[PDB]
Amino acid sequence: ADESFADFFYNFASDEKLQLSRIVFPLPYYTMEKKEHIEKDQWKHDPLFSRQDAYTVLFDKAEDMEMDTGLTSVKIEWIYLKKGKIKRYYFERLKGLWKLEAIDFADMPREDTGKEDFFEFYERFANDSVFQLSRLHEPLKFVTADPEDEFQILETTLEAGQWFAFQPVLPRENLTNVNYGQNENVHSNTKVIEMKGFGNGFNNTLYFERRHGLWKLMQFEDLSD
Amino acid sequence: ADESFADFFYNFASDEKLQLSRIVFPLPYYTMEKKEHIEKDQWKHDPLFSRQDAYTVLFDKAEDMEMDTGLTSVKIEWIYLKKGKIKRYYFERLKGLWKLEAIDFADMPREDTGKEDFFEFYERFANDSVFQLSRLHEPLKFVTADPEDEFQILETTLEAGQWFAFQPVLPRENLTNVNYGQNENVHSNTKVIEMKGFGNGFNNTLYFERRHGLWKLMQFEDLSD
Numbered sequence A, B: 001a002d003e004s005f006a007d008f009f010y011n012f013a014s015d016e017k018l019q020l021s022r023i024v025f026p027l028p029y030y031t032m033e034k035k036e037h038i039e040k041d042q043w044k045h046d047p048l049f050s051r052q053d054a055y056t057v058l059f060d061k062a063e064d065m066e067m068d069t070g071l072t073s074v075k076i077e078w079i080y081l082k083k084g085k086i087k088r089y090y091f092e093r094l095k096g097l098w099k100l101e102a103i104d105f106a107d108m109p110r111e112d113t114g115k116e117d118f119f120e121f122y123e124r125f126a127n128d129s130v131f132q133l134s135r136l137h138e139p140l141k142f143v144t145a146d147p148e149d150e151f152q153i154l155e156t157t158l159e160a161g162q163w164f165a166f167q168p169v170l171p172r173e174n175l176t177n178v179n180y181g182q183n184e185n186v187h188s189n190t191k192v193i194e195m196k197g198f199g200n201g202f203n204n205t206l207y208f209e210r211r212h213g214l215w216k217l218m219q220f221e222d223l224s225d
């Protein structure tokens, strides 16, 4: 009887009347160190990322990817790379029904203590191919699903040319996140971008690490079905 | 006293009243093997490519680039790569004043006699990095302006990785053209894409050739100021 987040999410993004009915009104909107409220009359249908061909899920470490169904909290996030902003949607499962409880629209939490920020790095990595080439770890690991036996992988290293040929279309302006409980700390020296499609079985994962003060692409895994 | 096309073009794209006054109404619109007319009342301001950071000029051969001011005809073109369509604007200098005389919106003239079409090739080259890598000529020539003495060039060859790092952002959905008299033949086995910016001095040129039935990137020249 409890709603599955994935099934609710699709319905919330695609049906306007359902969306309006599943949001707390007046909606708490935390922005610029103050708190606003969005009135029901002011709400604009939010298709979230239902008009995208793919979306991303972020992890501080690769081990954080191995995971309840008794989970009642989900944060959906939109990372505005160029604006340096983040929009967060607080979804909560109440009496088995998912509801939108609040929204944050704030400045991208920046890594302090004088250390290269992952999202500032990623923005340049995706938008500056010269910079992108300079930040590939040597060697650059490539993992793909073995087209034979079950759960098997093929592992090789990539030359710069091969990385640019086989890479997924890297998001240049926005990233997303689905936080279902994994650590989301501005101080991690590792970061993982998992890219997933909508009913096409596409799955590409990118593994980054801050090495001697600079973020580098460590590994590219293509687990696309 | 005769209008310069570049100065007219900027004004036509940026001023709505000027644009309306410089178009023949009813405007002959040649589309789908018939002829329509756009009424003055129906005209929507066309910013052309004034909201783009760059535009392209196309040549059948490199030698066609060396060139009147007594030129009174200019065709501006929009190549819709995915739709397989081309929109042409016929600009004519009458009594020293540029006017829009007619528009074509037709099917992309396709190369017949069973030969790889340049625009079908270019669309895949720009949208499929794997295909793009397979269509780089070996060796791939790179020419750049020498940062020393006047009119001098530096010539080297590029590795696949270097081509992807230094390439301009390749247009993926549309190309443009400014035809001021150069040959525009669907049967040429050579093609040149000259990419130019708006008041930033950016200039990148790409040289292609159909070699043993397949178009290949032969040379990349970066003459950016």
Ligand SMILES: [Cl-]
Residues within 6 Å of the ligand: A054, A055, A056, A171, A174, A175, A176
């Ligand atoms: Cl995304």
Ligand SMILES: [Cl-]
Residues within 6 Å of the ligand: A136, A137, A138, A139, A140, A158, A159, A160
């Ligand atoms: Cl590498």
Ligand SMILES: [Cl-]
Residues within 6 Å of the ligand: A210, A211, A212, A213
């Ligand atoms: Cl280190």
Ligand SMILES: [Cl-]
Residues within 6 Å of the ligand: B054, B055, B056, B171, B174, B175, B176
């Ligand atoms: Cl263009």
Ligand SMILES: [Cl-]
Residues within 6 Å of the ligand: B136, B137, B138, B139, B140, B158, B159, B160
């Ligand atoms: Cl090459």
Ligand SMILES: [Cl-]
Residues within 6 Å of the ligand: A159, A160, A161, A162, B159, B160, B161, B162
């Ligand atoms: Cl390479």
Ligand SMILES: [Cl-]
Residues within 6 Å of the ligand: B210, B211, B212, B213
């Ligand atoms: Cl040949």
